Amino acid sequence: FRILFRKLTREIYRYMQRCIETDRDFNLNLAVKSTTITSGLKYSLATGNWGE
DNA sequence: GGATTACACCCAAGACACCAGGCACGAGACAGAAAAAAACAACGAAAACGGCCACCACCCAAACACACCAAACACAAGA
């Protein structure tokens, strides 16, 4: 979970780099790609390979 | 620095890339580089003042001699 959540926070940074340039208010519900942690946990528990 | 580490067989389970900066084209600005002109060096022409030979007179150089001093064989002294 630590690995996958640092992935997610890096995505949030990469997104706030672009969207903020537009100079708009953003609701953060399009800023988090929730599928990263879900897909990672599911991949590890379904394959056994413990990691990205 | 690499390279190799038993042989045969059975079963199950998941994936069979997604997403992000570079090539082309897509347009500005100082730098990669090109054109010019004005204060840089020299040379031609005129002006008059510094340079060369006279003229010149007083100050330093040579001769004469003075007395004075430094000096050198040797008759005498001496160990």
CSV table of C-alpha atoms (C1' of nucleotides) in Angstrom, one decimal:
chain,number,residue,atom,x,y,z
A,1,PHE,CA,0.0,0.0,0.0
A,2,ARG,CA,2.9,2.4,0.7
A,3,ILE,CA,4.3,1.7,-2.8
A,4,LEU,CA,1.0,2.2,-4.5
A,5,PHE,CA,0.0,5.3,-2.6
A,6,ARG,CA,3.3,7.0,-3.4
A,7,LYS,CA,2.4,6.2,-7.0
A,8,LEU,CA,-1.0,7.8,-6.5
A,9,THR,CA,0.5,11.0,-4.9
A,10,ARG,CA,3.0,11.3,-7.7
A,11,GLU,CA,0.0,11.1,-10.1
A,12,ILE,CA,-1.7,13.9,-8.1
A,13,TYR,CA,1.4,16.1,-8.4
A,14,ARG,CA,1.8,15.3,-12.1
A,15,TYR,CA,-1.9,16.3,-12.6
A,16,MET,CA,-1.7,19.5,-10.5
A,17,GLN,CA,1.3,20.5,-12.7
A,18,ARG,CA,-1.0,20.6,-15.7
A,19,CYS,CA,-4.4,21.6,-14.6
A,20,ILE,CA,-3.3,24.5,-12.4
A,21,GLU,CA,-1.7,26.1,-15.5
A,22,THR,CA,-5.3,26.6,-16.8
A,23,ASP,CA,-5.9,28.8,-13.7
A,24,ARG,CA,-9.2,27.1,-12.7
A,25,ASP,CA,-10.8,25.7,-9.6
A,26,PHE,CA,-10.7,21.9,-9.6
A,27,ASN,CA,-12.7,19.5,-7.4
A,28,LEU,CA,-10.0,16.8,-7.0
A,29,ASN,CA,-12.5,14.0,-8.0
A,30,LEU,CA,-11.0,13.9,-11.5
A,31,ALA,CA,-7.4,14.4,-10.0
A,32,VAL,CA,-7.3,11.0,-8.3
A,33,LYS,CA,-7.2,7.9,-10.5
A,34,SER,CA,-8.5,5.5,-8.0
A,35,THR,CA,-7.8,2.5,-10.2
A,36,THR,CA,-4.1,2.5,-9.3
A,37,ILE,CA,-4.3,1.2,-5.7
A,38,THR,CA,-7.2,-1.1,-6.6
A,39,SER,CA,-5.5,-2.6,-9.6
A,40,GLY,CA,-2.2,-2.9,-7.7
A,41,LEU,CA,-3.7,-4.7,-4.7
A,42,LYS,CA,-5.7,-6.9,-7.0
A,43,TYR,CA,-2.7,-7.8,-9.1
A,44,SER,CA,-0.5,-8.7,-6.1
A,45,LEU,CA,-3.1,-10.7,-4.3
A,46,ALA,CA,-4.1,-12.5,-7.5
A,47,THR,CA,-0.6,-13.3,-8.8
A,48,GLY,CA,1.4,-13.4,-5.5
A,49,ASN,CA,4.1,-11.2,-7.0
A,50,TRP,CA,4.6,-8.7,-4.1
A,51,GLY,CA,5.4,-5.4,-5.8
A,52,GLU,CA,4.5,-3.2,-8.7
B,1,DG,C1',34.1,-9.4,-15.2
B,2,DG,C1',30.7,-14.4,-16.4
B,3,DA,C1',28.8,-19.5,-15.9
B,4,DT,C1',26.8,-23.7,-14.2
B,5,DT,C1',23.7,-26.0,-10.1
B,6,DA,C1',19.1,-33.9,-11.2
B,7,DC,C1',15.4,-36.7,-14.2
B,8,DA,C1',10.4,-37.8,-15.5
B,9,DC,C1',5.2,-36.7,-14.6
B,10,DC,C1',0.4,-34.2,-12.6
B,11,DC,C1',-2.6,-30.0,-11.5
B,12,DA,C1',-4.2,-24.9,-10.9
B,13,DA,C1',-4.1,-19.5,-11.8
B,14,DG,C1',-3.3,-14.7,-14.3
B,15,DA,C1',-2.2,-11.8,-18.6
B,16,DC,C1',-2.1,-11.9,-23.7
B,17,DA,C1',1.1,-3.1,-22.4
B,18,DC,C1',-1.6,2.2,-21.8
B,19,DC,C1',-0.1,7.0,-21.8
B,20,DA,C1',2.9,10.4,-22.0
B,21,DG,C1',7.1,13.7,-24.1
B,22,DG,C1',9.7,13.8,-28.7
B,23,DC,C1',9.6,14.8,-34.6
B,24,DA,C1',7.5,18.1,-37.8
B,25,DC,C1',6.3,21.9,-38.4
B,26,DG,C1',5.1,26.3,-36.0
B,27,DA,C1',6.4,31.2,-35.1
B,28,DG,C1',10.1,35.1,-32.1
B,29,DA,C1',15.6,36.9,-30.7
B,30,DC,C1',20.6,37.4,-29.8
B,31,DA,C1',23.7,35.1,-31.2
B,32,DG,C1',26.5,32.7,-35.5
B,33,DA,C1',27.8,35.5,-38.8
B,34,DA,C1',28.0,39.6,-42.7
B,35,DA,C1',28.1,45.0,-44.3
B,36,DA,C1',29.8,49.7,-43.4
B,37,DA,C1',32.2,54.1,-41.7
B,38,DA,C1',35.1,57.1,-38.8
B,39,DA,C1',38.8,57.9,-36.1
B,40,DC,C1',43.1,55.1,-36.8
B,41,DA,C1',48.3,54.9,-39.5
B,42,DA,C1',50.8,56.9,-43.4
B,43,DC,C1',52.2,60.6,-47.0
B,44,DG,C1',52.2,65.5,-50.2
B,45,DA,C1',52.6,70.9,-49.5
B,46,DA,C1',53.7,75.5,-46.9
B,47,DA,C1',56.3,78.2,-42.6
B,48,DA,C1',59.5,79.7,-39.9
B,49,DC,C1',62.5,78.5,-36.3
B,50,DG,C1',66.4,75.5,-34.8
B,51,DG,C1',71.1,74.3,-36.6
B,52,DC,C1',76.0,75.4,-38.7
B,53,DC,C1',80.0,78.6,-39.6
B,54,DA,C1',81.9,83.3,-37.9
B,55,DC,C1',83.3,86.3,-34.5
B,56,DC,C1',84.9,86.6,-30.6
B,57,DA,C1',87.0,87.2,-25.3
B,58,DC,C1',88.0,85.5,-20.8
B,59,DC,C1',89.2,81.1,-18.2
B,60,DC,C1',91.7,76.7,-18.0
B,61,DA,C1',96.1,74.2,-19.5
B,62,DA,C1',101.2,73.9,-20.2
B,63,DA,C1',106.3,75.5,-19.1
B,64,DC,C1',109.6,77.4,-15.8
B,65,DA,C1',111.3,77.3,-11.6
B,66,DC,C1',111.1,77.2,-6.5
B,67,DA,C1',111.4,74.4,-1.9
B,68,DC,C1',109.8,69.9,-0.2
B,69,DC,C1',109.3,65.2,0.3
B,70,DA,C1',109.6,60.1,-0.8
B,71,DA,C1',113.0,56.9,-1.6
B,72,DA,C1',117.3,53.7,-2.5
B,73,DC,C1',122.6,51.4,-2.4
B,74,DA,C1',125.8,51.0,1.2
B,75,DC,C1',129.4,52.3,5.5
B,76,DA,C1',128.7,51.8,9.4
B,77,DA,C1',126.7,49.7,13.3
B,78,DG,C1',124.8,45.5,15.3
B,79,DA,C1',123.4,39.6,17.0
